[PDB]
Amino acid sequence: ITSRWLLRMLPWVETKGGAYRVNRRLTFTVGDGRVEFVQDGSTVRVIPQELGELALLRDFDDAEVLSAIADRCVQRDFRAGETLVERGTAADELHLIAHGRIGQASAVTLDVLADGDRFGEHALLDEDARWSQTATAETSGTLLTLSRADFAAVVANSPALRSHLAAFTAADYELKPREYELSVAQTILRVHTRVADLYNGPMNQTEEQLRLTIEALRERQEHELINNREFGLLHNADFKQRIQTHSGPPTPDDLDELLCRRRGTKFFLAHPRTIAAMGREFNARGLYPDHTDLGGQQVPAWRGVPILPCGKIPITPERTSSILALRTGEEDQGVIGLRQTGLPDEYEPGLSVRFMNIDEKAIISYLVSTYYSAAILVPDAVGVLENVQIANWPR
Amino acid sequence: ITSRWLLRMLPWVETKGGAYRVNRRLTFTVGDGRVEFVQDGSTVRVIPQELGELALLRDFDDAEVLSAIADRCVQRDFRAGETLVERGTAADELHLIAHGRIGQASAVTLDVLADGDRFGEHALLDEDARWSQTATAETSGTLLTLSRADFAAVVANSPALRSHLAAFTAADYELKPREYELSVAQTILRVHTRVADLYNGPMNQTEEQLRLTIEALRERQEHELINNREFGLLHNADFKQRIQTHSGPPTPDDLDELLCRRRGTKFFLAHPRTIAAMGREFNARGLYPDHTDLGGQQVPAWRGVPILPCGKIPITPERTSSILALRTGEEDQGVIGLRQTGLPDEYEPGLSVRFMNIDEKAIISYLVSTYYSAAILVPDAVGVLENVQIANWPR
Amino acid sequence: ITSRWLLRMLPWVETKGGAYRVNRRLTFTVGDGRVEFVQDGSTVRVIPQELGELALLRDFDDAEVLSAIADRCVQRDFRAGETLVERGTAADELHLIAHGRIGQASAVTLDVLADGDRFGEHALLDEDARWSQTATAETSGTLLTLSRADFAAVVANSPALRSHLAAFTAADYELKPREYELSVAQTILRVHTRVADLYNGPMNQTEEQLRLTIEALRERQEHELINNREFGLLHNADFKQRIQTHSGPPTPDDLDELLCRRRGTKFFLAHPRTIAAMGREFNARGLYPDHTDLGGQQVPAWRGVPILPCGKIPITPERTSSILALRTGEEDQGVIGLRQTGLPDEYEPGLSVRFMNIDEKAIISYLVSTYYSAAILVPDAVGVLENVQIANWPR
Numbered sequence A, B, C: 001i002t003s004r005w006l007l008r009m010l011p012w013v014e015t016k017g018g019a020y021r022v023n024r025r026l027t028f029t030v031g032d033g034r035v036e037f038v039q040d041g042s043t044v045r046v047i048p049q050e051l052g053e054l055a056l057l058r059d060f061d062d063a064e065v066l067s068a069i070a071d072r073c074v075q076r077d078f079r080a081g082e083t084l085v086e087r088g089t090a091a092d093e094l095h096l097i098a099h100g101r102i103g104q105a106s107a108v109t110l111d112v113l114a115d116g117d118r119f120g121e122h123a124l125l126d127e128d129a130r131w132s133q134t135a136t137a138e139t140s141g142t143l144l145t146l147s148r149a150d151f152a153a154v155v156a157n158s159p160a161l162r163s164h165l166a167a168f169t170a171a172d173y174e175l176k177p178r179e180y181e182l183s184v185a186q187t188i189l190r191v192h193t194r195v196a197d198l199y200n201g202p203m204n205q206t207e208e209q210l211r212l213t214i215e216a217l218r219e220r221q222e223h224e225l226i227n228n229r230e231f232g233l234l235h236n237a238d239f240k241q242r243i244q245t246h247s248g249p250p251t252p253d254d255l256d257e258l259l260c261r262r263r264g265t266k267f268f269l270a271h272p273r274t275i276a277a278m279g280r281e282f283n284a285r286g287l288y289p290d291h292t293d294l295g296g297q298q299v300p301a302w303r304g305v306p307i308l309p310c311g312k313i314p315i316t317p318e319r320t321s322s323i324l325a326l327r328t329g330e331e332d333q334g335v336i337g338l339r340q341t342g343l344p345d346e347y348e349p350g351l352s353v354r355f356m357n358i359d360e361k362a363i364i365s366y367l368v369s370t371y372y373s374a375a376i377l378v379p380d381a382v383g384v385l386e387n388v389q390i391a392n393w394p395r
């Protein structure tokens, strides 16, 4: 029953056959010390050529071997405050950082690794490798893992890798399309025959129950568009577009930085608590931002970019939320809503309600279905500001 | 396949939402020795104020206490010839007679209690009470029971009742609406796909089976209108309107008395055996009653009031039936038939047949439903003559 | 004669029969440590199932027993600074906090209980319970009380509760409609016959007195809409919607928080002294808010939400007031004004003036009547900021 800003602001394009295709250009360079990954929503995998940045794998340019090694890595997720390695334990895994920040404490906290960083190089070759530092994850993220045994098996499979390893011991264009499949929000409405036969004259309680079902389906659509893992702006956003706050509260400098990373930002999405925190920061700084009108409706804005509240954005137990800055459009490469209309029996242009059967207990069943998904045409269309402290008050 | 006189004679009114409301006035007096009850079909309950007729409860006019005591009584039914109490057994229950006649035989048959009579007064207060007479039920009826333990608990709950009991030891208008909910006659018609695909050209065996189903539903409607317990003229009739025959056969004096109790009686309903017995009585008395025309159809009548046969009126094993005298109308306060038309898919104005599903065995299922009920606007609209001996012949 | 902003801003809906019905959904969870209540204006009562949160009543799910226990609690109001319990006095009452904050000082001020908190658990079972802490009420509020004797009586009534107590010693959907009855503002206008016979040519002093009467009735309507106990936005507002100021003066952070709790807030209502205090806070912070136009009339606003003055909001002797943030509408679930037009003799669409009689002293009497009430469709439509210090100046 709440406002669904993402549903009414995202343009909707008609897919054919319940599928969409997005052509991706992935520019990457070899030798800059940072590994680039391919992200399909929440699942990520290392580019086989990028893997050649490895010191023990430099100058190896055999597509088969690199592809096999890339396929043999395992994706892992780490939470905030979780310890990945401890001093003294033998090192046997190569860790490539895809997202998040990991503070490494030596025997003296050395530094903090970030996206594209590596630790566990020497563990691949020799068995004497031992973790001499402890890695504590300050922020949640993903991580690719290459085991020593798997690497030894891959070496024993390909003679060329063996020979190169024995010898060593002594902008690239990659197009790979991304396919989006329409997800479904489905439900079954059970209406008793008595409720359909009698309560139908001045108002249809069947029709009112159907309206409630449709509202619940739309709320689920918004919740999935925000929080789903396969598609969904929070997770299906480029790892480079996710920023961390400079101080923790959503200061206006953070909003300026969020507007810096992309051209023609359309709007901000944040929790109402986050909007209250931003207002508190504005009052502390002493500046009063203007309000702009969209669709004949006035709304708070920053630098003329409207800030829209969304209650479906999760709030962590540590009272930290995230802010989304995103541009929408098809002619301008942005974020589009994939949806198929023209269903066989539409109560609503995007909906389909169909009679299923009548049970022995005289209960009619209806199937209410809608098909939806989200696509991000270019990587720089959704930016996420993370770990925004929303429980800060002036003191 | 038989004639359904009640279905075609009762006027039908359209209920909204499958419910009807009847406003009841219940005039009662305190101190006349007879307790008045509230009857909702076959379930009856004593008026809390009427309960103050009790000698040990006179002058108590606390609504809470009387209401609690009234709620704590239990309804019981007794059959003809059943013994309720026996001499020697300790008395522990207060019995309020709601219907029927009970002959009380002392240590010498004292008399016969009837509707509104009480026995078991002294049993409420003291534990020494002992049944010194035997009560044999000559006629079936209902009876309210108040246990000694329950009364002691109610006394121990309310201090005011205690104080009044300790002290004693040394026309009223009550409006209470009655709500009628539409009952349903439902059935499932299973038609094989072969019978629907082939046998459909010159006549539809599916349509003939549906017609048979509709006829069975109408017969069930009549049987419920006569014999059902919640609604139904035999049971949902005022206890004052039920009369007993003077001699046992349906003599014309009994018909005159049945016509006496209400104004503008519309018709009589009786079993064909009962009509034969009435004809035998008429022949014995030597008078030949006239016949009147309703709907262009001639029918036997008494005093110009048509007598209609109904085979759904039960015949007891002792060969005793009952006769119903009833007036129908809405402008004239009488008996109406509650029925809702305008169903979503009507083969007939009151019917609804809907396709359910087709089974794996290629059997189509149809749901045939009709909604009906009966309402009696005023108490003096249905009178019942009971224990009519129908197996009497001249000798 | 003052401006009545609430009268002219609240939309008015036509009730039928002088009554309105609001369908309430009350989502509650068992085991989260907070008890949920049902509020009908100023009278509140604990949910029987919520009462099962009690440690000694956990896992008891008998509707009769819980309903009885809930009915047997007593509602109490406490003022600011009032001491409820003192150390040393034996504990005999269970206190469930419905509103307000209560600071508990042990033998060391432990903490401050708030809405949904409980103290007095152990007092229910044993008679040795003694208050060992003193509870001082910092803010006015309500409180449910369950006495030990009443609980013992309820235990002695139901055997199931006994058995469960002996054994222990060793999201839920609840729909309950709320009914609103139209209140009446009535008065008698006494006009002398001389004033009606002579002073009627160039102007009617009778008509001017009637106009003054109508103005007084409208002022009383506004005062009741704000301050009445049964209906009225100050009291008939959800206990969760009432907030406390962070510092005491109405700082802009408090206004941001007040706008945070609900979507599409329509306007603020505050005393003119409160508006002066808010302006002082704005000047201290150095920001100058914009002004918006409603009905062709310019008005001060915060974040585009107009701030309207209302002199009917009480000012406490401690110079503390309250602010109301509220959205109005029927299509958008908000606050509506229940009012019935089409009266038998209307001088004004909502009014009814009728001649009563002429006294022996030649004084004509007129009855001026209007019917009004207020309804809040959803709980999150009126928010109240309380204890706003309005006598603070820069120093």
Ligand SMILES: [Ca+2]
Binding pocket: A028, A029, A030, A031, A032, A033, A034, A035, A036, A050, A053
């Ligand atoms: Ca690289």
Ligand SMILES: [Ca+2]
Binding pocket: B028, B029, B030, B031, B032, B033, B034, B035, B036, B050, B053
């Ligand atoms: Ca009586």
Ligand SMILES: [Ca+2]
Binding pocket: C028, C029, C030, C031, C032, C033, C034, C035, C036, C050, C053
């Ligand atoms: Ca709870």
